[PDB]
DNA sequence: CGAATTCG
DNA sequence: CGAATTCG
C-alpha cells in the first residue's frame, strides 16, 4: 500500500502565493502521501518546500524559472538516485524528472513532468509523450514504473502518439474512469484564473508499468478543492491522491 | 484572334480592398494590369463597393458579378463580347466569421460551357478549421457540376500546404495548375512580406494563398502558362494590393 | 482556455 | 505572418 499526490501547484501564479503554497501543504499535511510529485514550482516555492516538508527528501528538476519536483517521505522512500532527460526542442523549460526508489522491497522508477503546455503545442508534447512512454520502458521488469504529471493531454494526442503501448495502464482508466476525479483543471469549479468559459481536462495523468498484477491502483481522489482565506484555491488545478497496493 | 480563341485566359487577385488607404491608385494599378493581358475572365476577392465604381471606370469592358452587395466581398469579372453570362450562383458558408462564401458563374466561351468559381476562403492560422471546411464545400461544388461543364476555381484560398493533406489532397478529377505545369518557381508565392511592403510587416513570410483548382474530363483542359502580376510598385510606392495576382492560360481540348 | 491585441 | 501578451 503506497500513496503519492501529484499536483501541478501554479507556482507561475504570483497571487496569493504564500498563502496558497501553504494551502497545498495543509493539503499534504491531511494525507501524508509516501512521493509528492509536483509542477510549477519556483525558487522559493522549492525554499519554503524545503523547511515545511522537511520530512522529504526533495529532488527537483530544475533551478530557476519553474520546474517539477519529487518529495520522497523519508523511513517510508529509500532514494536511490534523480535522472533528468531533456526535452532538446521544448520551448516551456520542459524535461523528464525521474527517481529510482524503493520501498522495502519493491523497486520503483517514480517519473514525473510538465509536458509543453497550450493546444498550438501538440506535436511538441506528443514528442514529450513519446520520450516519456519509452523511459518507462527501460527500466528492468522487476522494476514498477510510475509516472504522475500534468501532461497537458487530450485524448486525441495520447491516440496519434499511437496509444498507450499494451505494458502501459492508467490509473484513472485502470479505476474504470471514475466520474469524480476525471477532470483535474476545471474552469467551472476553480476560479483562480478567472476563465469566464467552462472547460474540463484530465491534463494531469497516472501511466504505470509492473509485471503482471503487481501494481494495483485502490484509489483516486481530487485534492486541493478548498478555498482558502483569500477566497482562491491553492492551484488551477486540482491535485489527484492515489494510493496503490504492490502485490507480488 | 482565331488562333486563340481556343484558349482561355483569367488573372485571380485578392485586391486588398480592405487597405483603404491608397486605394483608388492601387484600383487603378490593377485596372492597367487588366488592360495588358485582356483575360477573359477575372476573379477577385476583397472587393468593397467603392472599389466595384473603380472597376466600371477603368475596366468598364468587364461585366461584374459580386458575392455581395456591402462590406467586402468576391467578384468575378467577364469579358463583354467574349463571355456569355448564363447563372450566378452563390453557396453559403455557414460558419464564416468573415462573411466568406462560394461565387459561381456559369458562361460559355470559346465555344465551350464553364462553370467559374472563386472564393476567399477563412483567413489566419487560428481559422484553419473553418478555412478546411470551406475548402471542402468548394470541392464538393466543383465534383457537382456536370460533366460536360468545364469548372475552374480561382480564388484566395489562404491555404497552407498541410491543410490541403488534412483535407484528404485534392480529389482525382481536380488538378491545381501551379502543379500540373510543374510547381514552377516564379510563381509559386503570390503572398510575400518580403517582397511586398502593402501590410508592412517586418517579417519575411511568403505563401501561395492563392490558388487555381480545375476539373476536366481528362486531357480537355490543358493550363498553358501561369505567371503573376501585380510586381510593379505604384506611384505611392505600394503595390497594387499585398497580394500577388495570378494570370492564368488554358487550352480546352476535343 | 482562447479571442483579441500588439510586436517585430 | 507568427510570436508574445493580455484578460475575462
Ligand atoms: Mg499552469
Ligand atoms: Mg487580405
Known sequence: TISFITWNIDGLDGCNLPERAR??????????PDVVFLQEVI???????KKRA?????????????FTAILLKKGRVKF???????????????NLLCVNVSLGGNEFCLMTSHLESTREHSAERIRQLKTVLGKMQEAPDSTTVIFAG???????????????????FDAWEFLGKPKHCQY??????????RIPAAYKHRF??????????????????????????????????????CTLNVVL
Open 23 to 32: 494551502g497545498v501543504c495543509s493539503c499534504l499535511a491531511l494525507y501524508s
Open 43 to 49: 525558487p522559493p516555492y522549492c525554499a519554503y518546500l
Open 54 to 66: 522537511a520530512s522529504y527528501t526533495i529532488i527537483t528538476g530544475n533551478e530557476e524559472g519553474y
Open 80 to 94: 536511490k538516485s534523480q535522472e533528468i532527460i531533456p526535452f532538446p526542442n521544448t520551448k516551456m523549460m520542459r
Open 150 to 168: 500534468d501532461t497537458n493531454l487530450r485524448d486525441q494526442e495520447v491516440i496519434k502518439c499511437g496509444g498507450l503501448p499494451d505494458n502501459v
Open 184 to 193: 483535474t483543471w476545471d474552469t467551472k469549479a476553480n476560479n483562480n484564473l
Open 204 to 241: 494531469d495523468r497516472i501511466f504505470f508499468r509492473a509485471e503482471e498484477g503487481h501494481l494495483i491502483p485502490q484509489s483516486l481522489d481530487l485534492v486541493g478543492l478548498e478555498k482558502l482565506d483569500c477566497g482562491r484555491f491553492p492551484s488551477d488545478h486540482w491535485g489527484l491522491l
